[PDB]
Design a protein around this ligand. Structure first.
Ligand SMILES: [Mg+2]
Ligand SMILES: [Mg+2]
Ligand SMILES: [Mg+2]
Ligand SMILES: [Mg+2]
Ligand SMILES: [Mg+2]
Ligand SMILES: [Mg+2]
Ligand SMILES: [Mg+2]
Ligand SMILES: [Mg+2]
Ligand SMILES: [Mg+2]
Ligand SMILES: [Mg+2]
Ligand SMILES: [Mg+2]
Ligand SMILES: [Mg+2]
Ligand SMILES: [Mg+2]
Ligand SMILES: [Mg+2]
Ligand SMILES: [Mg+2]
Ligand SMILES: [Mg+2]
Ligand SMILES: [Mg+2]
Ligand SMILES: [Mg+2]
Ligand SMILES: [Mg+2]
Ligand SMILES: [Mg+2]
Ligand SMILES: [Mg+2]
Ligand SMILES: [Mg+2]
Ligand SMILES: [Mg+2]
Ligand SMILES: [Mg+2]
Ligand SMILES: [Mg+2]
Ligand SMILES: [Mg+2]
Ligand SMILES: [Mg+2]
Ligand SMILES: [Mg+2]
Ligand SMILES: [Mg+2]
Ligand SMILES: [Mg+2]
Ligand SMILES: [Mg+2]
Ligand SMILES: [Mg+2]
Ligand SMILES: [Mg+2]
Lengths: 258, 134, 158
RNA sequence: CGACUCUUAGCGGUGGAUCACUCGGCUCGUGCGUCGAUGAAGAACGCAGCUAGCUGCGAGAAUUAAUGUGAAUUGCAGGACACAUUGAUCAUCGACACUUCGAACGCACUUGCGGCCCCGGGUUCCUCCCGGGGCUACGCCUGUCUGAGCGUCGCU
RNA sequence: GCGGGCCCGGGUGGAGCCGCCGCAGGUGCAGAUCUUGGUGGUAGUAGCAAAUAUUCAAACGAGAACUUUGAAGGCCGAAGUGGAGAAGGGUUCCAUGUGAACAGCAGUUGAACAUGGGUCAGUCGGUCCUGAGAGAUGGGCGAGCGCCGUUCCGAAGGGACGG
RNA sequence: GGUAUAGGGGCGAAAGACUAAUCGAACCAUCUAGUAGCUGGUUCCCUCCGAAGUUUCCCUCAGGAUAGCUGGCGCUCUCGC
RNA sequence: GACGUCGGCUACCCACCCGACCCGUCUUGAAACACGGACCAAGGAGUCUAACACGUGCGCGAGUCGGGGGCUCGCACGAAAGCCGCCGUGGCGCAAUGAAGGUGAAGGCCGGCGCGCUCGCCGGCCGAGGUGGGAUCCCGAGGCCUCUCCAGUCCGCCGAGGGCGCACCACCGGCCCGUCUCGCCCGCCGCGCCGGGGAGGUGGAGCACGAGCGCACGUGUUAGGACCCGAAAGAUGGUGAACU
RNA sequence: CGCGACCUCAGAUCAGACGUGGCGACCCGCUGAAUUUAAGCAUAUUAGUCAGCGGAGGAGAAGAAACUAACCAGGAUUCCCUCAGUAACGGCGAGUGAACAGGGAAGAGCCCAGCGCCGAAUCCCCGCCCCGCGGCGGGGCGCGGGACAUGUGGCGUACGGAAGACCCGCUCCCCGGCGCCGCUCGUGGGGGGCCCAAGUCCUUCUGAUCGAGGCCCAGCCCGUGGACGGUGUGAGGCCGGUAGCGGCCCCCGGCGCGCCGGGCCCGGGUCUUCCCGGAGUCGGGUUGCUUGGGAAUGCAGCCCAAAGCGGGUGGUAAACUCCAUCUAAGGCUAAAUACCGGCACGAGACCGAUAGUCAACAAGUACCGUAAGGGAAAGUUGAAAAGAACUUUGAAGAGAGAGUUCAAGAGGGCGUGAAACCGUUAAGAGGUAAACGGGUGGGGUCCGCGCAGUCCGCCCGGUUCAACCCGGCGGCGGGUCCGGCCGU
């Protein structure tokens, strides 16, 4: 916000009618340039901005807990479906399996060389290569506001418990580390886009059913929560349209252009 | 990534600290790397430049393999003057061309008691660090 | 000016309310400071409960509730006399004592006396000096636990 | 085809718009949260080899001492230092120092007039005179000393 | 491309910039006798006309109507265009030098600019006294900063001689 | 020359005169971005729809409320099936 | 027709024919002898908070919620995010009506007991009444046929006609609370200035098998400076008699 | 006729201390409006707000019921949510508007007067001795002084207390010093100082790389370090830093150990006997202000003016009658709370020199007014001054050559350099002011051809493998579901 005193620190009175001036408050007296000039107006030099910004703007917004869980579940489900991950731009071509789950020994890593070797073995290093190729200077006033460097977001690593894995996967650009019990939608869906490539750990992967549960079981870690129900089950429209049951109850189409 | 909540990490503030540093801090700022032979011998990465060292220019117009003595250290301008790194003025007067210490490699140190103490401290700290690494 | 069936509203913004606007950007910092102070206070009294002294059983007035049971300020002097604890000694062992609370019903008196007896049963009175004087518990039940008691002592359940 | 005038273009003028830069602001948050009669805030006057302003300093006046670091400051000369030496500059700063007004304190505000003690010049305390040093404001508490009362009493 | 505008070519420029999917706003100017800054016609125009008046020769000087010197003609005509002060000004005073800017023409001149220099008290005044008046203490008032009042509801002289 | 009278106050041989170029109530700062049913202005394109100056009430007549005129969003149905 | 010749709607200049008054604003009426306007560049005016109403999107749903607090990080990304016997203290909704003392939403049918007395009491049954219009669904005679005559289960379209009838509308009934009139009976711990029930009108923002809660977006009305600029005024505290 | 005590009252350059002023963002005590709204306006609202005065601290104030309630009761104060835009107030208009309970943050209780018991058992000052003395204390020795009986100290205060009787088990807390080991959570408490990884590798651009290509795996090495800044562009590895339960060197703070000087003969339960309360105060009338408080919520000037199974409260005034709840008119106290000023840090979906504080710069500066006060404009050469030597015309300002630089087509208010406006050059035109819309024509500017541009793309006529077999590899679909898994 701007200062409350901005523009009103002067003592300016408007010269009355009968003078060539245009009825604007002007600086009183003095032998200065800033004398009989103009103040208190949004159109005047110095002046005061129209509707000055206030600190008590509604900066923070509120979202329902159930909707937040819905969104995080949708993002987690969209972490599958390699088409969506490819649509996010992640170089996932050579990854052996998109639901990439790795052993629990990764938490025991404590050096960056082990982390990069594991990433190359899993063939997820191409994402880091793309992140490296994406490093450049930001355009605009952000450079002088501690936002000079920008780069592409890379793969996300989800672990069950912290045993030094973060320090290993800390100096690799683009890698974000999340815990299963405190998954963040802001990092699972960067930019509001539901696609994201994630690397799972076996314990973290097994904890997913304990975190949210299935449709026939409760979460067992959230007091009252179940997975949302599907509005439609057979999502494949092409299979439904050409099904024999539908085709038996259709008229002959008219495609003769007149 | 920096984690200490008492470091600057601010563009304007870091620039202000750099350009308003006192003389003793500017001495540490004006540091130059040692040669490969000196790095192997003393096990020291770099040392602050001094008035009586031998200097090779690594970058710039005067880049070359020549070895020149330091003439003076100008801490106000963050620059040093070298022996043969000089230019001719309009009237024929010779003027030293300033070379930043970061673009300079030391090939021979001016060893005094304090220089030896600094070398020993740096070597011992590096040894402690590598022992911690192992 | 009214216009085709709106509510009649009387906002209380006729004073200079913008002068006394209280923002809440201090809320997370306040919570962090409170948590740090709470942890420091818990660490200062290493074996004593972090919640504090034991609280009595209290029933609420104002027939609206009339049935809930909450924690009181302290045990009345009659309850201490029945349980056999000196009022001045009790505050030094972690028992809340207040002298204003009356005692009308026998049921509340008996419930609080039983609560005091139960608290005394599960109490580990450390010796004043390394040598064990009278009323001090054995060294067997001193190394077995020296940790805080998270949450309220003997939580009240309706 | 002249001169003048009108439009467009190239170049050259007045002007400083736009863009990119920023040791500056605005907003939020954290810790701490400390002035003064042992003289505060503020003001005046002075202090550098060459010095106007800003900043810093107080007749020890661009800084003294001590600690840490360790070879400069620099616009020019001069140089102190031997940088194998508490040792140049810097930062810290705990020792010392800190002109005149100002709650401002001998009386007033002119920088004018005084009183009480000590020392020196003059003397051989001799008072004039000169210089230096320490005191001399209001209110108030405890205590001391000297006092007043046709206040209340006791002896003669 | 109906349009809001946009994409390329050339020149200058020297260090950052844009498209797409979403988010947010101090987000689009022809006017408000709008605010700030700059520039035209007017216009080489109005004007450089209150108080009688200048001329000759020489010198310095690149340069002379305006400087200096000499001569001539004039005016102010002792309630002066003379000689000294008070208030005010504050270096404007003096010597040397420059002619960037100012002295509404010019200048070799200046109260301009740059270097230096200059104010000497027992007797001349402040300092002393009181006037009209102002203003403490005592006293009274006042929520309070303070105010009333100058002898009024005061144990108000700390001085002196002789012993 | 010194001194005294200071703003709903002073002073006035009296003109509402003077009170620092302002006096039928000085100047400075703040309340204050005082209020205005009254003037002036109110910033890109295209497409579609498209008015009223009329009834009643109001210390109401240069203004409002209320009906009327307008736009947008729909919904319930019928059908050149 | 092809080495000084081609195509270039739009823009550079000029000419000709026709048309053609300077923009913005108040206004019934502006080119006006109505007001603002020399020219250029930059800045410049419907914003934010809170309260409502409606519409729209999302999640849950007779429930919904995160206010505040607490547990995880030493804040890079974070003052975020995740969680809570706090999952609900508490708000909103699920019940309304009277000033209040208070009361407070279902009836109908069948057989019996009092005289079925449109009144009271016993057992069983159906469980938001009925009428009209009602999108859609059910039955559906029969027809259309099929290379010849008959029989014929099957895949069809139309299908007169007959029904169950969403949502909603209109009406007739029913129930709840206040009030008015006429009345007959029921119960007791205390038999009373006790309490309860009926019929017929009327008043209510009600019930009659529910729809809200939270978040976000837009519009409209307000309190705030409130689209921007503009007074003649009023109050508080201080400075001036160097003019007069 | 004086002296000696006491009570009231003066003088001190008497001995030793204390207050004065400043800041004032947050806090406490007073005083205290009008703009504005009510479409006018006088009660109301603005508003216990601004202005004015006084007084502190790191917080302040408040604070342990003369309380809330009427319930099966709760239990100091402060703050958050809710209560609640509710009860209530109000030309009952505009508008104003709490409290209780409930959930939390924090949580800590106490001391006098009086009543009474102890030989004043109490306190201050001066002298000497011992310790330490830079936030002047402890002990001892002084017929050394003073204060105090017009009352100091010990026990003891509403939750009862004191003294005896005799039931029960037994004897460590605090203050001032002397030193000592553990370096005491942001994972070593606070402050300061010195240090700890890896390319200037090979070509290639450039004035200069930090650019581009490549280097046992995105490439060479480090990575618990890939933040940031500087270095002649755009640097993880050139430099400072960055990460680290990383190191070393000093000071300070805090918790614990042994010693010395000390102070300290300190209980619970029952019974018995006594004792136990703050006066011009409560309360009443009154009037003024204030409040939601309405026959009067609180604060008050004046008058009246108490009692002790009394007094206060129980939200409608009064009488009678029972109930419930506290004990006013004396005092202290941290925590959860606030912080547009001061000291030192961190951050940003904020502005980017007419913006952002008035002030990015010698800014509360220059300058204006007698004064209270008013108050600006103003950033950018270049990587490096390498800031143009020298020759020539001019008195000089100014030019012409030369030189530096990648570039002065960057020359000391010098980055980029628009429009208004001006000079000149090239072209066109010109007696109905200029300018504008529609339609053509003429002349220029370059653009795209072309020395024909006759444009191609399929089918047809005039050196090896497809056809067809062998082997291998991979894939598609199928059902006897052939068999198992998978799966409703
Ligand atoms: Mg708690
Ligand atoms: Mg003329
Ligand atoms: Mg005459
Ligand atoms: Mg004269
Ligand atoms: Mg002169
Ligand atoms: Mg002139
Ligand atoms: Mg008259
Ligand atoms: Mg306005
Ligand atoms: Mg009107
Ligand atoms: Mg329409
Ligand atoms: Mg139309
Ligand atoms: Mg009009
Ligand atoms: Mg008219
Ligand atoms: Mg018009
Ligand atoms: Mg005009
Ligand atoms: Mg603009
Ligand atoms: Mg509406
Ligand atoms: Mg105004
Ligand atoms: Mg008035
Ligand atoms: Mg009004
Ligand atoms: Mg009005
Ligand atoms: Mg009015
Ligand atoms: Mg009021
Ligand atoms: Mg207190
Ligand atoms: Mg309470
Ligand atoms: Mg409500
Ligand atoms: Mg006593
Ligand atoms: Mg850089
Ligand atoms: Mg870098
Ligand atoms: Mg390094
Ligand atoms: Mg009553
Ligand atoms: Mg500015
Ligand atoms: Mg330029």
């Amino acid at each position: 916000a701007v200062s409350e005193l901005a523009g009103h620190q002067t003592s300016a009175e408007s010269w009355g009618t009968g003078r060539a001036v245009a009825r604007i408050p002007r600086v009183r007296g003095g032998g200065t340039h800033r004398s009989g000039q103009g103040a208190f107006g949004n159109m005047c030099r110095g002046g005061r901005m129209f509707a000055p910004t206030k600190t008590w703007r509604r900066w923070h917004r509120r979202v329902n807990t159930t909707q937040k869980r819905y969104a995080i579940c949708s993002a987690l489900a969209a972490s599958a479906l390699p088409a969506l991950v490819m649509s996010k731009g992640h170089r996932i071509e050579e990854v052996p399996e998109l639901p990439l789950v790795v052993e629990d020994k990764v938490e025991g890593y404590k050096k960056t060389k082990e982390a990069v070797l594991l990433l190359k073995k899993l063939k997820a290093w191409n994402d880091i290569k793309k992140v490296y190729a994406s490093q450049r200077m930001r355009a605009g006033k952000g450079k002088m506001r501690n936002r000079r460097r920008i780069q592409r977001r890379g793969p996300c690593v989800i672990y069950n418990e912290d045993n030094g894995i973060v320090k290993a996967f800390r100096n690799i650009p683009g890698i974000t580390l999340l815990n299963v019990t405190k998954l963040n939608i802001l990092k699972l869906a960067p930019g509001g886009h539901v696609g994201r490539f994630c690397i799972w750990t076996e314990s973290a992967f097994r904890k997913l059913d304990d975190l949210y549960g299935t449709w026939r079981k409760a979460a067992s870690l959230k007091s009252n929560y179940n997975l949302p129900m599907h509005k439609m089950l057979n999502t494949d429209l092409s299979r439904i349209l050409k099904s024999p049951e539908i085709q038996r109850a259709l008229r002959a189409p008219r495609k003769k252009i007149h | 990534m920096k984690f200490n909540p008492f470091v600057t990490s601010d563009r304007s503030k870091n620039r202000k600290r750099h350009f308003n540093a006192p003389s003793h801090i500017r001495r540490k700022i004006m540091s130059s790397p040692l040669s490969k032979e000196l790095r192997q011998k003393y096990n020291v990465r770099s040392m602050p430049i001094r008035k009586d060292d031998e200097v090779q220019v690594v970058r710039g117009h005067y880049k070359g393999q020549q070895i020149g003595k330091v003439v003076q250290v100008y801490r106000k301008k963050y620059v040093i003057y070298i022996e043969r790194v000089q230019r001719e003025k309009a009237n024929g007067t010779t003027v030293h061309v300033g070379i930043h210490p970061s673009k300079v490699v030391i090939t021979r140190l001016k060893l005094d008691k304090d220089r030896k103490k600094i070398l020993e401290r740096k070597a011992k700290s590096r040894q402690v660090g590598k022992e911690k690494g192992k | 000016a009214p216009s085709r069936n709106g509510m009649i509203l009387k906002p209380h913004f006729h004073k200079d309310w913008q002068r006394r606007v209280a923002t809440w950007f201090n809320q997370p910092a306040r919570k962090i400071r409170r948590r740090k102070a709470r942890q420091a206070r818990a660490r200062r009294i290493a074996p004593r409960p972090a919640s504090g002294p034991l609280r009595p059983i209290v029933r609420c007035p104002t027939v609206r509730y009339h049935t809930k049971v909450r924690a009181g300020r302290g045990f009345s002097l009659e309850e201490l006399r029945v349980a056999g604890i000196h009022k001045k000694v009790a505050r030094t062992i972690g028992i809340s004592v207040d002298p204003r609370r009356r005692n009308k019903s026998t049921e509340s008196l008996q419930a609080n006396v039983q609560r005091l007896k139960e608290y005394r049963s599960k109490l580990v009175l450390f010796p004043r000096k390394p040598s064990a004087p009278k009323k001090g518990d054995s060294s067997a039940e001193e190394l077995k636990l020296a940790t805080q008691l998270t949450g309220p002592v003997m939580p009240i359940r309706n």
